[PDB]
Design an enzyme around this catalytic site. Structure first.
Site, PDB file in Angstrom:
ATOM      1  N   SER A   1       0.855  -1.199   0.000  1.00 35.96           N
ATOM      2  CA  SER A   1       0.000   0.000   0.000  1.00 35.96           C
ATOM      3  C   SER A   1       0.887   1.244   0.000  1.00 35.96           C
ATOM      4  CB  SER A   1      -1.003  -0.101   1.155  1.00 35.96           C
ATOM      5  OG  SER A   1      -2.176   0.669   0.879  1.00 35.96           O
TER       6      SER A   1
ATOM      7  N   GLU B   1      -8.807  -5.512  -4.544  1.00 39.03           N
ATOM      8  CA  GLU B   1      -8.224  -4.338  -3.881  1.00 39.03           C
ATOM      9  C   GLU B   1      -9.276  -3.363  -3.353  1.00 39.03           C
ATOM     10  OE1 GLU B   1      -5.266  -4.017  -3.184  1.00 39.03           O
ATOM     11  OE2 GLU B   1      -4.002  -5.095  -4.635  1.00 39.03           O
TER      12      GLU B   1
ATOM     13  N   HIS C   1      -7.593  -5.867  -0.053  1.00 38.41           N
ATOM     14  CA  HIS C   1      -6.396  -5.059   0.111  1.00 38.41           C
ATOM     15  C   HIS C   1      -5.722  -5.388   1.441  1.00 38.41           C
ATOM     16  CE1 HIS C   1      -3.791  -1.671  -0.734  1.00 38.41           C
ATOM     17  NE2 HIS C   1      -4.075  -1.120   0.432  1.00 38.41           N
TER      18      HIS C   1
HETATM   19  C1  LIG Z   1      -3.828  -2.664   5.248  1.00 38.76           C
HETATM   20  C2  LIG Z   1      -3.148  -1.328   5.337  1.00 38.76           C
HETATM   21  C3  LIG Z   1      -1.696  -1.505   5.802  1.00 38.76           C
HETATM   22  C4  LIG Z   1      -3.160  -0.709   3.947  1.00 38.76           C
HETATM   23  C5  LIG Z   1      -3.913  -0.291   6.279  1.00 38.76           C
HETATM   24  N1  LIG Z   1      -4.735  -0.836   7.364  1.00 38.76           N
HETATM   25  C6  LIG Z   1      -6.138  -0.163   7.527  1.00 38.76           C
HETATM   26  C7  LIG Z   1      -6.165   1.130   8.477  1.00 38.76           C
HETATM   27  O1  LIG Z   1      -5.044   1.098   9.290  1.00 38.76           O
HETATM   28  C8  LIG Z   1      -5.997   2.398   7.599  1.00 38.76           C
HETATM   29  C9  LIG Z   1      -6.570   3.690   8.272  1.00 38.76           C
HETATM   30  C10 LIG Z   1      -6.590   4.905   7.336  1.00 38.76           C
HETATM   31  C11 LIG Z   1      -7.771   5.415   6.785  1.00 38.76           C
HETATM   32  C12 LIG Z   1      -7.773   6.512   5.909  1.00 38.76           C
HETATM   33  C13 LIG Z   1      -6.591   7.140   5.541  1.00 38.76           C
HETATM   34  C14 LIG Z   1      -5.398   6.636   6.061  1.00 38.76           C
HETATM   35  C15 LIG Z   1      -5.402   5.536   6.933  1.00 38.76           C
HETATM   36  N2  LIG Z   1      -6.575   2.128   6.247  1.00 38.76           N
HETATM   37  C16 LIG Z   1      -5.783   2.096   5.038  1.00 38.76           C
HETATM   38  O2  LIG Z   1      -4.558   2.275   5.131  1.00 38.76           O
HETATM   39  C17 LIG Z   1      -6.367   1.914   3.646  1.00 38.76           C
HETATM   40  C18 LIG Z   1      -7.915   1.996   3.844  1.00 38.76           C
HETATM   41  C19 LIG Z   1      -8.657   0.823   4.000  1.00 38.76           C
HETATM   42  C20 LIG Z   1     -10.048   0.842   4.198  1.00 38.76           C
HETATM   43  C21 LIG Z   1     -10.738   2.058   4.268  1.00 38.76           C
HETATM   44  C22 LIG Z   1     -10.024   3.252   4.142  1.00 38.76           C
HETATM   45  C23 LIG Z   1      -8.635   3.212   3.940  1.00 38.76           C
HETATM   46  C24 LIG Z   1      -5.752   3.055   2.611  1.00 38.76           C
HETATM   47  C25 LIG Z   1      -5.709   4.468   2.878  1.00 38.76           C
HETATM   48  C26 LIG Z   1      -5.170   5.411   1.973  1.00 38.76           C
HETATM   49  C27 LIG Z   1      -4.623   4.993   0.740  1.00 38.76           C
HETATM   50  C28 LIG Z   1      -4.634   3.638   0.456  1.00 38.76           C
HETATM   51  C29 LIG Z   1      -5.174   2.703   1.369  1.00 38.76           C
END
Ligand SMILES: CC(C)(C)C[NH2+]C[C@@H](O)[C@H](Cc1ccccc1)NC(=O)C(c1ccccc1)c1ccccc1
Ligand SMILES: *[C@@H]1O[C@H](CO[C@@H]2O[C@@H](C)[C@@H](O)[C@@H](O)[C@@H]2O)[C@@H](O[C@@H]2O[C@H](CO)[C@@H](O)[C@H](O)[C@H]2NC(C)=O)[C@H](O)[C@H]1NC(C)=O
Ligand SMILES: *[C@@H]1O[C@H](CO[C@@H]2O[C@@H](C)[C@@H](O)[C@@H](O)[C@@H]2O)[C@@H](O[C@@H]2O[C@H](CO)[C@@H](O)[C@H](O)[C@H]2NC(C)=O)[C@H](O)[C@H]1NC(C)=O
Ligand SMILES: *[C@@H]1O[C@H](CO[C@@H]2O[C@@H](C)[C@@H](O)[C@@H](O)[C@@H]2O)[C@@H](O[C@@H]2O[C@H](CO)[C@@H](O)[C@H](O)[C@H]2NC(C)=O)[C@H](O)[C@H]1NC(C)=O
Ligand SMILES: *[C@@H]1O[C@H](CO[C@@H]2O[C@@H](C)[C@@H](O)[C@@H](O)[C@@H]2O)[C@@H](O)[C@H](O)[C@H]1NC(C)=O
Ligand SMILES: CC(=O)N[C@H]1[C@H]([C@H](O)[C@H](O)CO)O[C@@](O)(C(=O)O)C[C@@H]1O
Ligand SMILES: *[C@@H]1O[C@H](CO)[C@@H](O)[C@H](O)[C@H]1NC(C)=O
Ligand SMILES: *[C@@H]1O[C@H](CO)[C@@H](O)[C@H](O)[C@H]1NC(C)=O
Length: 527
Positions: A196, A323, A436
């Site tokens: 990611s 994804e 994802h």
């Molecule tokens: C599995 C991973 C290591 C990827 C993350 N674990 C999940 C959780 O911690 C974070 C919290 C978050 C939310 C919004 C902005 C930043 C962080 N969510 C993501 O990171 C993911 C996402 C998933 C589902 C709903 C929204 C967002 C994403 C956000 C931005 C760009 C691409 C993917």
């Protein structure tokens, strides 16, 4: 008891029993002086030697960050939340060493995702001990600053230049160059891997000249810098830096005076207002992300990519079958993880508005037109599946394929995978499919642990994936040569062959999502 002499001092590790064997772990080595006080928002600064023995026997503090609370008590969301204290004092790394001590082992350096706003290297699914045990590589992972504290941008101003979290990652690759030989590791054989925003980070180190000598090869799982969420424009970054100043009473005329003000605010006050700096956001919203700072990033990265300005080496790139689904249950109407989320055309159209907020009425209709040409029009999940494909193709699959095409066009071997196995332990419902982030446990070898209730077919799939990742890091070539495995061809701009990863038939396929990606990569950038 094993003590290692590093450049800045001695560190003590700890022994671990894995599969009738032994791995030596060093959890929580500092790699920069804590970015506290006048150091907040600044590039990371070098450490001072310690004369004592540093005890690296427990994961260190995670960096300050907002938490996902959208599903309290649910393992599917909470497995990603920080599992150590949050603290601005968080610039630490971990090292897993094979035992017996290796002599010139290839190093795998992991960079976690989390949309540049969240994440930590201490997560159970990032545990590097299985890879050290099973492939005799060394696994390193680091914490890097995240959100405003890691990516607040006033371009040119070293009090808040931008890309600090990326410079955190860089200073830890630096640490591996200066120190990993003391641990049995080969500094000339270092592969970066990440998922990611960690993968987008890996792709940016390919582009950043300051990182070109700090690694050998690169692996990008479900991410790349050309994904729409991965780079914050200098326009947005200014508006976002200023809006954060307003919401904290730090609006000043002298720009360095704003930073000094923001330096007195308590961490939670910066965190709480991070969410409101964007008026209309998406579930994917990267409030404070990578910018074109003129230091780490010298130009807009689409231009560097297109004109071959990047480190010349092998890449391994891939995406998961579904994804996009994970984001639907974080706001899209008609969706829930606790039912099958059959949505109607009208709900679909509302869903487009949430995921493409500032996009014209015509842009949104073109997405609908391209994704509502059903083979059967009587299938009730038609709109549910289409909205997932839209989000995943737009935000992940098509940018990864385009990154792979453009990168391979400059003469380097590229390998592309399509991961389509749904974990038997996946806590989210079956309609969300191959989500994802849910290849990570297979890359790190968790199903190699027989006690953990993964099926036997999952053990074998992880075992092969782990061999291919290690062969790629070791030898530039992600083959499993011994057991009679499907050979993984290089990805070329003409044929565009890729390898599918699943428990049943591993296959060679061509031109993944060809129809869908010509829409996103060619037509949609115009709207
Ligand atoms: C599995 C991973 C290591 C990827 C993350 N674990 C999940 C959780 O911690 C974070 C919290 C978050 C939310 C919004 C902005 C930043 C962080 N969510 C993501 O990171 C993911 C996402 C998933 C589902 C709903 C929204 C967002 C994403 C956000 C931005 C760009 C691409 C993917
Ligand atoms: C450890 O091994 C390196 C060689 O690493 C390999 O070559 C890289 C270019 C890359 O392809 C890696 O993935 C490989 O595993 C040795 O590096 C050499 O060191 C000597 C110094 O005597 C130097 O003259 C050579 O130019 C270096 N490079 C090569 C390619 O030989 C290194 O010496 C080894 N160190 C130990 C302690 O075993
Ligand atoms: C740039 O910022 C302005 C204002 O900044 C913030 O807007 C809100 C999100 C709020 O949370 C505060 O931090 C700031 O006031 C944006 O202008 C606002 O836009 C919304 C809807 O678009 C509107 O309802 C507000 O009245 C506007 N306020 C002002 C002061 O103009 C603006 O949209 C941002 N983006 C661009 C491209 O200008
Ligand atoms: C699937 O569930 C969504 C979400 O509704 C919530 O979760 C359910 C499992 C249940 O516990 C509800 O009480 C919750 O509200 C449903 O969407 C809601 O539908 C109601 C009634 O039509 C509507 O008033 C709400 O606005 C909707 N909420 C959202 C977020 O869309 C949806 O109808 C369910 N669909 C199926 C096929 O089960
Ligand atoms: C660092 O750790 C030292 C050793 O403590 C013990 O070390 C190994 C052998 C294990 O038995 C471990 O569980 C023990 O805690 C301490 O003597 C020393 O005081 C520690 N230093 C600091 C600064 O905490
Ligand atoms: C309704 C609720 O809160 N939890 C339910 C979960 C969720 O829907 C998960 O997201 C999918 O496992 O699913 C179950 O039915 C299941 O098959 O284990 C158990 C439980 O009733
Ligand atoms: C802003 O304040 C800093 C520190 O006091 C000073 O060095 C700088 O010259 C000032 N700039 C302006 C434009 O006032
Ligand atoms: C190959 O098969 C053997 C069983 O004959 C198994 O023990 C081994 O782990 C397999 N290797 C890989 C890399 O999958």
């Amino acid at each position: 008891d094993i003590i290692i002499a590093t450049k800045n001092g001695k560190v003590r590790g700890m022994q671990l029993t894995v599969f009738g064997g032994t791995v030596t772990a060093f959890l929580g080595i500092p790699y920069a002086q804590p970015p506290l006080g006048r150091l907040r928002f600044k590039k990371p600064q070098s450490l001072t030697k310690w004369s004592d023995i540093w005890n690296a026997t427990k994961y260190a503090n995670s960096c300050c960050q907002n938490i996902d609370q959208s599903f309290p008590g649910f393992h599917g969301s909470e497995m990603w939340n920080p599992n150590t204290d949050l603290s601005e004092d968080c610039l630490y790394l971990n090292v897993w060493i094979p035992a017996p001590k290796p002599k010139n082992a290839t190093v795998l350096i992991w960079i976690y995702g989390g949309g540049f706003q969240t994440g930590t290297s201490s997560l159970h699914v990032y545990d590097g001990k299985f890879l050290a045990r099973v492939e005799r590589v060394i696994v390193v992972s680091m914490n890097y600053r995240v959100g405003a504290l890691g990516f607040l941008a006033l371009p040119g101003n070293p009090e808040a230049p931008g890309n600090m979290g990326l410079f955190d990652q860089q200073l830890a690759l630096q640490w591996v160059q200066k120190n990993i030989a003391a641990f049995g590791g080969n500094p000339k054989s270092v592969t970066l891997f990440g998922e990611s925003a960690g993968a987008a980070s890996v792709s940016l180190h390919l582009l950043s000249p300051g990182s070109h000598s700090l690694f050998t090869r690169a692996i990008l799982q479900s991410g790349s810098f050309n994904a729409p969420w991965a780079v914050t424009s200098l326009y947005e970054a200014r508006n976002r830096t200023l809006n954060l100043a307003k919401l904290t009473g730090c609006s000043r005329e002298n720009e360095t005076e704003i930073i000094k003000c923001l330096r007195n605010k308590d961490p939670q006050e910066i965190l709480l207002n991070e969410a409101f700096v964007v008026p209309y956001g998406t579930p994917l919203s990267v409030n404070f992300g990578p910018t074109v700072d003129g230091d780490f990033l010298t130009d807009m990265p689409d231009i560097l990519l297109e004109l071959g300005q990047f480190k010349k080496t092998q890449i391994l790139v891939g995406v998961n079958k579904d994804e996009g689904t994970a984001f639907l249950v974080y706001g899209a109407p008609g969706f829930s993880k606790d039912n099958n989320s059959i949505i109607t055309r009208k709900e679909f159209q509302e869903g487009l508005k949430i995921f493409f907020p500032g996009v014209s009425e015509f842009g949104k209709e073109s997405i609908l037109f391209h994704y509502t040409d059903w083979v059967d029009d009587q299938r009730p999940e038609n709109y549910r599946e289409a909205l997932g494909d839209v989000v995943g193709d737009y935000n992940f699959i098509c940018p990864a394929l385009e990154f792979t095409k453009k990168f391979s066009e400059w003469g380097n071997n590229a390998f592309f995978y399509y991961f389509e196995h749904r974990s038997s332990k996946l806590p989210w419902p079956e309609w969300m499919g191959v989500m994802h982030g849910y290849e990570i446990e297979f890359v790190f070898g968790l199903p190699l642990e027989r006690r953990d209730q993964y099926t036997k077919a999952e053990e074998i799939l992880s075992r092969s994936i782990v061999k291919r990742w290690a062969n790629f890091a070791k030898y530039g070539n992600p083959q499993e040569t011994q057991n009679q495995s499907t050979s993984w061809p290089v990805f070329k701009s003409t044929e565009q062959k890729y390898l599918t990863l699943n428990t049943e038939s591993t296959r060679i396929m061509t031109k993944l999502r060809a129809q869908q990606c010509r829409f996103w990569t060619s037509f949609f950038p115009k709207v």
